[PDB]
Design a protein around this ligand. Structure first.
Ligand SMILES: *[C@H]1O[C@H](CO)[C@@H](O[C@@H]2O[C@H](CO)[C@@H](O[C@@H]3O[C@H](CO)[C@@H](O)[C@H](O)[C@@H]3O)[C@H](O)[C@H]2NC(C)=O)[C@H](O)[C@H]1NC(C)=O
Ligand SMILES: CC(=O)N[C@@H]1[C@@H](O)[C@H](O)[C@@H](CO)O[C@H]1O
Ligand SMILES: *[C@@H]1O[C@H](CO)[C@@H](O)[C@H](O)[C@H]1NC(C)=O
Lengths: 111, 473, 101
């Protein structure tokens, strides 16, 4: 399930079956790994522009720098852009048993 | 044939589709017209004005209008906002007012020219309490949609201080689909007795949700305070093995009731329904039934007040109607069999506190009666178990015994065989020898089942709940 | 004619004036809190009086700061319910048991 994107200035990152709804009962961990002095650009294109729908503690998306957990988002919002200086971005996507929805898309790039 | 007119007010589609209340009212006037047993010497016409929803001034002007032509009384619009306008109009100009939809009772409104055939919320809520008390639930949960549901259940809300309970309160959000995350937390909440105060349309819009998140299993039991519990799209869900429970003053026992129901059903899908919404097409709704009854009680009074006159009054000639005194009193004092059962007015709160209620529940087939309720005694709800069916006194081994067992090396084994054999013959061992011997001694019949979790069993501290053999026992 | 009007104290009676001013464009101001119906589209009305919604949030904060583990709410007439619904929804979020008389 993990989509490793090492040593690419650009590529794409999105939920499983991304145009479709995400499969349930996933637990997939993702990495953005960069060289020293190589800065990472992380970008969320929303597939669904609204203030987040299900704001709660299941089906969260964690974001990890280095691990002080920066944040967890859920429902149907985009986090704004976050600028990487730890250069090792760790992305965890979790899925529940019974809440299945539009999923998400991302864009990573090295700067 | 004394001509009379009844003011008609309908917050409606403002478009082509015609509303159910207008329909039942005209159905009512026709019913008067055909059977002269009521009013042999009298026939009443009517003026039916139509307005916008939640829009006072427009209603008030229309109120002055249906004053202009003169009636005996108005029939209230089915929403409280302009309903207050209607009422502060009626008692202001003395014409009796009849309301169908529940309004927010304003504690000190000294109006006196109004009644409401609607089952007053207090009595309903008291029955709710009696019901839940009988079912011995503790972690009940209410979900409403807007404000006034809480009021409908205030008597419920105040229960805990007298009755050992708990209940959180949860809200269906602004739009209907928004209730899915609510079901999410309730799943997290694990609240297995959730009463609902909600419009049956929303009940439908949420049952798809509940089955969709699979919440409907046999443990969960919901009770729906609404009164159009009849027209639910019941059929698929009754095999989810859920209990529902609800009320219906809407009698169906009278065959006259039925006959009128099919006459309606002919005139009803006559109006284009919404089968895509998941409602059973062809069944008249509780409100429309109420407002059918209301004309009839008006009549059953008025036939004894031929001194009825219709003063063509104006809103600015502030002197009230000439004959609102005794006529309104008559309605207060009258009694009748409408389409809901015994009809009466409290004559104290100037409303209704008395009626007859059949509690109904989702059986294996659908809506089937599970009792009766009335103000005086309260709940006489009975039970489908009576007459001791298929029961023998001092019967020996009338039912067989469900014997559990564990698989162990020298204790219980499989009779080593090649062809596929089953039943209580796969299992063979020392414990089986003991079981057979003691069953021959005590003369019983037994079936064999392995424990599924497959262990002796021990107390799991995190839930204080047994496991395996002990738990299945 | 007026430049505008100040509202009467009640809720119910105030409804009518609110509507009337909307029927002619008059700006209507009010003084006491009432329950707004979520299905009125009107525009020309404002309330000085602080809403009881935010008040409930503040009360809830105060409750938690004191760290109460039991409480009773008491009102006068059922309208106080609407007035407090937000707090009344305490238990879902935090560990609060509240009762009402
Ligand atoms: C007109 O009369 C009716 C019927 O008496 C009033 O409704 C209320 O009815 C209940 C009985 O159903 C009366 O007793 C109450 O019983 C419940 C049982 O759960 C109990 O919890 C209450 O403490 C109370 O004992 C109740 O007294 C009665 N309310 C009143 C004020 O009489 C209706 O309210 C009457 N209207 C007026 C203005 O009197
Ligand atoms: C038919 C129906 O309404 N479902 C359940 C039924 O399976 C269960 O045996 C009973 C006792 O809990 O409660 C109800
Ligand atoms: C309960 O119902 C039975 C049958 O109708 C009736 O005989 C009995 O009087 C009722 N009891 C109450 C409490 O009304």
């Amino acid at each position: 399930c993990g989509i490793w994107v090492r040593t690419s200035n650009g590529g794409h990152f999105a939920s499983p079956n991304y145009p479709d709804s995400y499969p349930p009962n996933k637990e997939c961990i993702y990495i953005l790994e960069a060289a020293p002095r190589q800065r990472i650009e992380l970008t969320f294109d929303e597939r669904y522009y609204i203030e987040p729908s299900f704001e709660c503690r299941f089906d969260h998306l964690e974001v990890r720098d280095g691990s002080p957990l920066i944040d967890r988002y859920c429902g149907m919002k985009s986090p704004a852009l976050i600028r990487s200086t730890g250069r090792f971005m760790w992305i965890k996507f979790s899925s529940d048993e019974e809440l299945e929805g539009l999923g998400f898309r991302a864009k990573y790039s090295f700067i | 044939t004394h001509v009379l007119r009844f003011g008609g007010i309908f917050e409606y589609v403002e478009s082509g589709p015609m509303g159910a209340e207008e329909l039942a009212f005209r159905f009512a006037v026709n019913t008067i017209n055909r059977n002269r047993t009521l009013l042999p010497n009298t026939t009443l016409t009517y003026d039916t004005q139509k307005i916008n929803l939640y829009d006072s001034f427009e209603a008030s002007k229309k109120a002055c209008d249906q004053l202009s032509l003169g009636v005996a009384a108005i029939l209230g619009p089915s929403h409280s906002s302009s309903a207050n306008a209607v009422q502060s109009i009626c008692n202001a100009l003395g014409v009796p007012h009849i309301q169908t939809r529940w309004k927010h009772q304003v504690s000190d409104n000294k109006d006196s020219f109004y009644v409401s055939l609607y089952p007053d919320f207090s009595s309903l809520s008291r029955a709710i309490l009696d019901l839940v008390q009988f079912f011995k639930w503790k972690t009940v949960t209410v979900v409403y949609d807007d404000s006034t549901g809480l009021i409908r259940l205030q008597e419920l809300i105040k229960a805990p201080s007298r009755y050992n309970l708990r209940l959180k309160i949860r809200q269906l959000p602004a739009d209907t689909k928004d209730a899915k995350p609510l079901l999410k937390e309730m799943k997290r909440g694990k609240e297995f007795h959730v009463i609902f105060d909600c419009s049956h349309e929303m009940a439908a819009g949420i049952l798809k949700q509940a089955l969709a998140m699979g919440m409907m299993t046999e443990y969960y039991h919901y009770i729906f305070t609404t009164l159009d519990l009849f027209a639910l799209d019941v059929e698929p869900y009754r095999y989810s093995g859920v209990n529902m429970t609800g009320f219906r003053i809407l009698n169906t026992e009278n065959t006259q009731v039925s006959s009128i129901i099919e006459k309606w059903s002919m005139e009803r899908l006559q109006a284009p329904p919404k089968p895509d919404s998941g409602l059973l097409d062809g069944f008249m709704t509780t409100d429309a039934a109420l407002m059918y009854d209301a004309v009839h009680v008006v009549s059953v009074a008025v036939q004894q007040f031929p001194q009825m006159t219709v003063s063509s009054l104006q809103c600015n000639r502030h002197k009230p109607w000439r004959f609102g005194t005794r006529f309104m009193s008559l309605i207060k004092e009258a009694h009748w069999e409408g389409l809901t059962g015994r009809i009466t007015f409290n004559k104290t709160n100037g409303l209704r506190t008395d009626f007859d209620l059949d509690v109904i529940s989702l059986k294996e087939e659908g809506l089937e009666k599970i009792g009766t309720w009335d103000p005086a005694s309260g709940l006489n709800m009975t039970e489908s178990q009576k007459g001791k069916p298929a029961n023998i006194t001092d019967s020996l081994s009338n039912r067989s015994l469900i014997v559990t067992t564990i698989l162990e090396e020298p204790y219980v084994l499989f009779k080593k065989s090649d062809k596929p054999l089953y039943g209580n013959d796969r299992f063979e061992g020392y414990c089986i020898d003991l079981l057979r011997e003691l069953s021959t001694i005590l003369g019983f019949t037994y079936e064999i089942r392995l424990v599924e979790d497959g262990k002796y069993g021990a107390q799991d501290d995190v839930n204080g709940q047994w496991n395996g053999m002990v738990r299945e026992l």
